Assembly symmetry: C2
Homo-oligomer: 105 residues x 2
């Protein structure tokens, strides 16, 4: 249950004008990013309670891996692609996970 | 600072819509509970019919109280009725927030 894993939780929304494009963009971003060093999970999803509101769920092996992702080129570029779709509410917060606890399954 | 739970599950095509409805209902209920900071149910854009449960709890105890609720047992039963067999939930004790955007 000891872990160095880092969790990132991101949310964003788009209007109906841009959301289809956003869905595709998020899928593209996920496909690429999952192949980065230490990326254990990069899931893009849509809130079942709130159409047009999206989640970006990431698990990184350790802080260093997440840092590499944040520091290597392409982050600003992806953010700008989101801004191009008039996304103004991107929030991303990460956390070091101190223990990993199986609840079920 | 908090406990983060990450859950994944899927249902057959026949059952997916009802699953979506059940998840929405579970979230509506759970968000009202003591210590629930966040409870979001979402669908993987890359894989339709695959769902995520994202929960933030104030502490492990609050999560454990939730998990022990009879209503939560009934919800897990309702998942089984839809032939969900792959529910996997992992919880993590989270450190302090690292603000990346917003």
């Amino acid at each position: 249950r000891r872990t160095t894993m880092v969790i990132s939780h991101g949310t964003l929304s788009a209007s109906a004008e841009h959301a289809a494009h956003l869905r595709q963009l998020l899928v593209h971003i996920a496909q690429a990013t999952r192949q980065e060093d230490g990326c254990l999970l990069y899931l893009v999803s849509e809130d079942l309670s709130q159409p047009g509101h999206f989640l970006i769920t990431e698990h990184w092996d350790n802080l260093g891996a997440m840092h590499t992702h944040l520091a290597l080129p392409g982050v600003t570029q992806a953010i700008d692609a989101l801004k191009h779709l008039n996304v103004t509410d991107l929030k991303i917060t990460a956390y070091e996970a101190g223990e990993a606890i199986n609840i079920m399954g």
